[PDB]
Design an enzyme around this catalytic site. Structure first.
Site, mmCIF file in Angstrom:
data_model
loop_
_atom_site.group_PDB
_atom_site.id
_atom_site.type_symbol
_atom_site.label_atom_id
_atom_site.label_comp_id
_atom_site.label_asym_id
_atom_site.label_seq_id
_atom_site.Cartn_x
_atom_site.Cartn_y
_atom_site.Cartn_z
ATOM 1 N N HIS A 146 0.919 -1.484 0.074
ATOM 2 C CA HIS A 146 0.038 0.059 0.034
ATOM 3 C C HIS A 146 0.738 1.227 -0.251
ATOM 4 C CE1 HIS A 146 -2.707 -3.164 1.499
ATOM 5 N NE2 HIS A 146 -3.822 -2.355 0.906
ATOM 6 N N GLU B 114 3.417 -2.067 7.148
ATOM 7 C CA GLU B 114 4.495 -1.981 6.072
ATOM 8 C C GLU B 114 5.301 -1.228 6.492
ATOM 9 O OE1 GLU B 114 1.931 -0.970 2.623
ATOM 10 O OE2 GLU B 114 0.559 -2.719 2.910
ATOM 11 N N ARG C 70 -22.169 10.937 20.140
ATOM 12 C CA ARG C 70 -22.714 12.151 19.757
ATOM 13 C C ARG C 70 -24.280 11.881 18.956
ATOM 14 N NH1 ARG C 70 -17.155 13.015 18.069
ATOM 15 N NH2 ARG C 70 -16.784 15.443 18.591
ATOM 16 N N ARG D 8 -15.563 18.302 24.806
ATOM 17 C CA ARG D 8 -17.050 18.154 24.587
ATOM 18 C C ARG D 8 -18.037 18.688 25.760
ATOM 19 N NH1 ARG D 8 -17.974 13.399 21.925
ATOM 20 N NH2 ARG D 8 -20.266 13.662 22.386
#
Ligand SMILES: [Mg+2]
Ligand SMILES: [Mg+2]
Ligand code: NA
Ligand code: NA
Ligand code: NA
Ligand code: NA
Ligand code: NA
Ligand code: NA
Ligand code: NA
Ligand code: NA
Ligand code: NA
Ligand code: NA
Ligand code: NA
Lengths: 252, 251, 251, 246, 252, 247
Positions: free
Chosen positions: C5, C77, C165, C220
């Site tokens: 990738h 990777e 949420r 929050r």
């Protein structure tokens, strides 16, 4: 203007679209959009590239998801906030059945939930199942392209490596849960591995959204890992032509 | 060679590879008589078995009893005798206000609120029908003129607490199931029943083709009470539809 | 060599054994330019890769994308190409009233609200950073003049329901996550993000050193829309801090 | 009222507070005729219901069908009509080499390899009989001259993979159940059947008294697929019922 | 005013202590206390022996826990009711890694939760992690003693026998969950087994209390070299010397 | 050969195949002195070990400490030395209003709210006593004149949150245990304690015979924290149950 946190688009940008085609790779977005009329780039942020286009006069959104359920769940939610109700996943996949050949196409009828994000929408007992109309449209479009088409179960993993029982890795180890798992899924008739359908299908089926997945087979895990370039290119081109035709059938 | 519970041999099935599987043994003869040359084969426990002919091809009708455990026995033993396609038929109550008495439900996937499904595949595996069977059931149901709903069914090992019923001896529902009906409703689930998770998981993980179709006979979200004529018509339509779905599956 | 990738080879990394791993591909160049001789290596999907030099030693900067799944690919990777130490940097939303916008958090352990961590170790295993990396991140963060919190981070596979949420398309949160923000607050959890459980579990069970440092961009308990200049200042400080933490890890 | 599945009213039961619950509807009349004045009440699906009299007291006999789900319906509906004590009789396959065909087993606890038990209590809760019922079943079984074993029973939602049978259509057993028979054998489990986990968990968590007694029809160390010992089993359960009713 | 139910001490008995050293063995309590100033016996009930002492003029509690999370959870709770906020676990341990030698010290950075009591404080997803200041103080104290120090993960088991994959037992059986588990933890880098840290660390990290664990290595299951009497006595003595110095660093 | 923790050899047990296992080491001598020729064998950590003679047969008394983990060590090591039958005695808190302080409870099965039981058998396996031991305990308890209850016991790895106590430092109980006392009450559970799930599961899955008998010292419908006749009666009962188990 109603905005979303990640995708960088407004409801007005979508020109009334209620259907999205959702590839994983941002580079595929323009390639899908150009198969339709009047493609327009809307935004690119992180793994999310967004275009609009027109199909038989109706607005359609094309939006990449990135790899994995978590980034997919953000894109689907934010598109739904902006009015999208139908989600057509397209991509390429690795088959695990000897009878599925490279270049065939798979339409998922249900997913093995080897992910975490699906559990944020429904408990594990709930089926990761596509909308029947979407699956029907995808099968028809795939058959009409001349491809050999398989309908069946897909194993949807939060990892590319251990959760798909790959051993050619840095540690060469696979946790107990996944040792012997490819053979188990093969024996249970599972067709292929990918990394987003369990999240997509569970989220949508439990939230009043229509979703399905179609994929071109680029490798067979019983054969070799390195695809041949011309074969892969042909499969990728056919897959996006198929998903656009499936969208046409959904908007009929 | 006679299977242990069903009491039939492979020769008794006259080459049938498709079975219609109602839950109630008393419905087996009624389904068989919608086809040609119905023949009583055996009855033992909850398992009544008939054969019939549909467009010249042998079809088995076999009851399952209530629940995944008894269903799993019937499916296994029929598969030992060559049956590969299983069409479940019944009637059901719905949990969505837009699903009316007399409509039909074809299950696209089941919530696995059972135990027997786990004896075939871990919970992550989807309780999903064979696509050809689901397609045939949808076509037969729509050709009947009924309004047809494709969607998710919640498949419970109990009739009472697992369907969040409180009108019971204790009036108690264990924590897992408190508030569960509203949760499934909000998730778009169409109905409860008691066998599809086992049937679909077993078949989808074992190389067998299965699906489920049901006529809606009650809706616990609706105040209106259906009449006897509508209920009789719905039961009759459900089995006419499953026989036409079998016709569409024949090769 | 070649990886599936990331599109880079071992030679491209010039001997680097340490990577800084932001989530956003656009941040990669910004981090690389805080070091010497930044070089663009590749960009494919959510993976943008640069190399740079820090005190004469090669360092790789590689984005992960959002979520454990894409992160797990990048870490694997990079490890195939010789990387052994992974420094995660980003911005986060705090859930404790005493943690202010503009503070920094160094994760001492993560609540595993993800799926990918389970592909490396069962749930009982702790999502814990390498002690040297956490120590270096704390020192770099404190030396910058920031207010620094060490503690537990809740690491969720979703941005929306798994962070409780409700301002969403359905407005619903599955039972597992209803009341969860208050539960984590009461348990002393500092913040939410979406990659640390996967990163820390994968590395701690695989012989790799990892840690996470983040600047607080929202609280929050306050508001969801951050102020632009404050956010810019916090982002700039966070990447300066992670580069200094990398300096402290070099040997 | 008439209960939804069993087709009987409270008045039909003539004050019975104890039920004998075999699995097979055809065994209901056979049990009832061991008592006085047996009368057929109803038959619907797998549920055949008789009433009889034992030492002058009314007793119900009601089949359950195979499996926890159908059993759970019968127990609930009988409890709605006043039944408080449930005596299960049936057959079983032994997994210990020392348990022989024709022996009797009284379950002291069940391995919960079912789903319906979880609809009454979480998995941590023990699938345990009422102590008086288990005591009465042991005594009745001993007094019949049988060789009796007390111990743990593995209670499975399937006959085939959950009992680790391989002579099947797929010839495969899912990971959870591979090697499970040997594991239960090593843990001292006596036998397999398909209803006790549901029955015992439901009753022990709902204020109902329950127990199970069974006759061994196969030893699974010998093979996979299987009158004095069916006849003796129902004689024993009726005598256990007599002991429960004072 | 209250006397706690199991420990049999009052808040006044602790003379303002906010830090406790918590060995497992009641016989070790006096040995730790005598390394400090003015040690005084407070109480002994069941596995709970409690002393007070003074360290750089500050009151410190020493309290044994017994073996296992359940008895540990009682001691920590009751001390917290009486004002204790920091808990330093000390002991000796085996090791499961070849590079960990007898006489080395292990400071736990996280625990594998192979216990039950941790779940009575936080669900399994929550990390059994020490307070960072405590772990830092323990590392520094251990290094200053001259020992080789390992920071890493510990597997914390509710049993000594099957949960540590021991087969030299009455039945010789190990349940499926634990078959092959020692090698799995070894391959994941786990340093050692013990029986209390998962409960201690999870309880404290989720309850506003600071905790950590340090242990001297007295045996290595991967090595069949029998350490002599001298190195073992030295390791026990060093372990408690280290924990007292870690306490000094926490109170500075 | 001396076991790792208990500090005794097989010879020290004089052929005993039955053990009485209280939790508190200080109770060991008290139980041993109810029998003939009590002999102190060893004390280390929470493990105090005595031997005595009951109708001429050797019996071991060995404390377990609090909790499944320390109990599992004692049971294993006693089994290594030939013990096959384990009789647990102790105190308990009732959660049913009809069970009174001073009554006795014999556990017929335990709710497995512990961790150590899972180290012997998966959760599906029942934490159930040996039928002969439960029968002997019921008989001994009833013969004493006590009011005796047979039923399910909830067996918790904690004293505080797992028994849904709120008079604690945090005053909080994790989601799993919120509302749990009422749930167990509604399910007919009689009492809470902390060792039976481990003991019964370990023994029932390992070829050992075990049971539990306890005297009620608090009713949790009345208060959270307990406040001697019953303790003495409980150990007299367990010794008589041991007498009934001797062959
Ligand atoms: Mg075969
Ligand atoms: Mg308070
Ligand atoms: Na991504
Ligand atoms: Na081929
Ligand atoms: Na509740
Ligand atoms: Na299939
Ligand atoms: Na809720
Ligand atoms: Na049945
Ligand atoms: Na296997
Ligand atoms: Na203890
Ligand atoms: Na259990
Ligand atoms: Na709560
Ligand atoms: Na036993």
């Amino acid at each position: 203007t109603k905005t979303v946190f990640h995708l960088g688009v407004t409801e007005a940008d979508l020109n009334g679209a209620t259907l999205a085609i959702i590839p994983g790779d941002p580079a595929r977005v323009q390639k899908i959009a150009e198969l339709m009329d009047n493609p327009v780039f809307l935004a690119s942020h992180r793994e999310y590239t967004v275009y609009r286009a027109e199909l038989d006069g109706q607005s359609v959104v094309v939006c990449s998801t990135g790899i994995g359920g978590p980034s997919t769940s953000i894109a689907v939610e934010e598109l739904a906030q902006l009015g999208v109700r139908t989600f057509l996943r397209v991509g390429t996949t690795g088959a695990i059945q000897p009878h599925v050949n490279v270049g065939d196409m798979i339409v998922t009828t249900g997913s093995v939930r080897l992910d975490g994000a699906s559990l944020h929408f429904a408990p594990m007992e709930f089926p990761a199942v596509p909308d029947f109309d979407v699956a029907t449209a995808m099968k028809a479009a795939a058959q009409e392209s001349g491809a050999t088409v398989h309908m069946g179960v897909t194993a949807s993993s939060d990892t590319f490596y251990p959760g798909q029982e790959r051993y050619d890795t840095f540690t060469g180890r696979v946790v107990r849960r996944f040792q012997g798992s490819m053979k188990e899924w093969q024996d249970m008739g599972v067709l292929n591995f990918e990394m987003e359908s369990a999240t997509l299908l569970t989220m949508c089926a439990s939230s009043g959204l229509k979703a399905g997945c179609v994929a071109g087979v680029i490798i067979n895990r019983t054969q070799k890992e390195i695809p041949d370039h011309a074969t892969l290119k042909e499969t990728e081109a056919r897959s996006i032509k198929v998903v656009v035709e499936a969208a046409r059938k959904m908007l009929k």
